[PDB]
Amino acid sequence: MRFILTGVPGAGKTTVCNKLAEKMSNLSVVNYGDVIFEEAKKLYPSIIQVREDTRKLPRADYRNIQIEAAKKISLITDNLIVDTHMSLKTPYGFYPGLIPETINIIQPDGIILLEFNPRDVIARREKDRLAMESETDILLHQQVNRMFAVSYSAINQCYVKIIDLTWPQEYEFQHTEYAVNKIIEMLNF
Amino acid sequence: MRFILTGVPGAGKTTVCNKLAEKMSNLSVVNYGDVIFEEAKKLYPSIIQVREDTRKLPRADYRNIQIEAAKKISLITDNLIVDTHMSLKTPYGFYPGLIPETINIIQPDGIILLEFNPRDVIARREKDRLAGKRMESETDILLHQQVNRMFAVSYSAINQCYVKIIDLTWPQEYEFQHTEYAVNKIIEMLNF
Amino acid sequence: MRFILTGVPGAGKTTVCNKLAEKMSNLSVVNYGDVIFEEAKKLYPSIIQVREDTRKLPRADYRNIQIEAAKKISLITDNLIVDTHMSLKTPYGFYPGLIPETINIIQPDGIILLEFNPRDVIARREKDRLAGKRDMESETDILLHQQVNRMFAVSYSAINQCYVKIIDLTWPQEYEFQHTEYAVNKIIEMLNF
Ligand SMILES: Cc1cn([C@H]2C[C@H](O)[C@@H](COP(=O)(O)OP(=O)(O)OP(=O)(O)O)O2)c(=O)[nH]c1=O
Ligand SMILES: Cc1cn([C@H]2C[C@H](O)[C@@H](COP(=O)(O)OP(=O)(O)OP(=O)(O)O)O2)c(=O)[nH]c1=O
Ligand SMILES: Cc1cn([C@H]2C[C@H](O)[C@@H](COP(=O)(O)OP(=O)(O)OP(=O)(O)O)O2)c(=O)[nH]c1=O
Description:
Three copies of one chain form a homotrimer. By secondary structure, chain A is an alpha/beta fold. Helix content of chain A is 51%, strand content 19%. One thymidine-5'-triphosphate (TTP) binds next to helix 1, helix 5 and helix 7 of chain C. It is classed as transferase. The entry lists the keywords Phosphotransferase, Odinarchaeota Adenylate kinase, Asgard group, dTTP, transferase.
């Protein structure tokens, strides 16, 4: 099966991927961003250095890089988790991390949303910082990602699975276990 | 005028249809699932003889049955209200209760949403379970209705159709006052 | 750049449009309803004479009007701000203000949603209902309308890969027109990036 895992940044969406890769073999977890970056570095070596450098690219060249990366990912032949973002905040607004080409090429069985509590995201981004959105911004962002998922579902006829993590953690990294277990229950169902 | 009446199941969405049919001769109320049935058992009487059996069809046959149902419906000259679901909860998440085709074939003027209060929904589902006619919580129902709103808005943006939301969240003086309100609102919509 | 500015009616959407068109250069602000009305008036002068005569037409003729408006609108400049409505409440339920064509013809960089607090909107509408410019919506009606505008914008973004910027003007003002100055600064900051 093919599922696209999404969530707001700085919340634990990478943690679930690490723990899914660990706890389940026969499962290929892939970061769409890393594949796009590698394809870009290969196609534009003399100018692409770090991840941010992908903003230098023209619109159409970047779209082609996305298409190529989706082509690469479509080759994975067993259980697949595609790690990416539905929306990314820009000074110009929320921008889709996906494109219809990705949905058509990868042919994902479904999308998964990881919804958290704003307070959690705040503390989490603080931890990642030591090594500026408000709770309102984060609620807005999550509702926006939800609308994006419902739109992509209405266009491509795919599932949208919302995993709730608003509840308080008795111990740190409880959200991770819950999400990983739900996703594995979903894969073996 | 043709509309797609929808809402979470177990809340009164069929009562509205039946009452509407009682209360308006200039109208035809049809349930998409029931037409899917009639047209499937017309072709596969061997393995399809009860509703819950439709799971057995491959996606090819079942999609063709959906297309044939929407086509048979589209032959209704008079006002039309198509009862169906926007999204169905599954172990894989929500899935659209409509395929783009349906919408194209029917050419619905709009989509009507019936938004209930979650407790009503659960209470109704319990009472309907005890009558031999059948676990979600209030949060799950709120989420389902919100996702239904989002599906209606997406379909409108894609196909250019109205999105009429009917509020049945208020407390009822007497049982089945929600159906009275919804029926009257829809008729008002038609006779304008 | 090209942006489509929207928000519930009677809340301060043309205010921001005017403050923009004046406080910026190379910036052309244009209202979609006005171009629609002008083109319809030209094509059907016999019956188009008030902004409500426009919907005495079949939706196909009106759709052609909308496509012409868009075409006509894009031609105006290489920079733009299109004042329009994401959705409009009607006896049959919220109807889209744009069409998949509008955005293919104008190729807008993004959509902007000015999201207000409904209480402010009620007050503004009834202050407009005293100055001659203006209808009985409530707080919940308006919250639903704004949520529906949000959903429409996100849908169109998913469809055409455009930004959806949301400007929060729900907070209470320290003085009149603080919301408008805030929004104008946000949009300018965005453009001068
Ligand atoms: C699940 C969880 C994460 N965290 C911390 C660990 C992480 O360092 C931080 C952010 O989670 P990340 O694992 O970094 O999630 P991400 O997808 O946003 O990362 P990336 O920038 O690469 O896209 O949150 C907690 O403090 N408590 C928790 O319960
Ligand atoms: C409208 C209404 C229904 N009820 C009861 C009648 C039924 O037992 C149940 C309503 O369920 P139904 O009216 O039968 O609707 P449904 O769940 O079958 O819809 P769908 O097509 O999606 O499957 O609740 C009330 O008690 N009060 C009410 O106001
Ligand atoms: C921003 C703002 C507007 N107002 C008033 C001024 C106007 O009467 C009204 C602002 O709304 P409009 O500027 O008229 O915005 P609009 O184009 O969306 O409305 P319409 O469809 O009617 O053309 O509210 C205030 O009183 N304080 C404020 O801070």
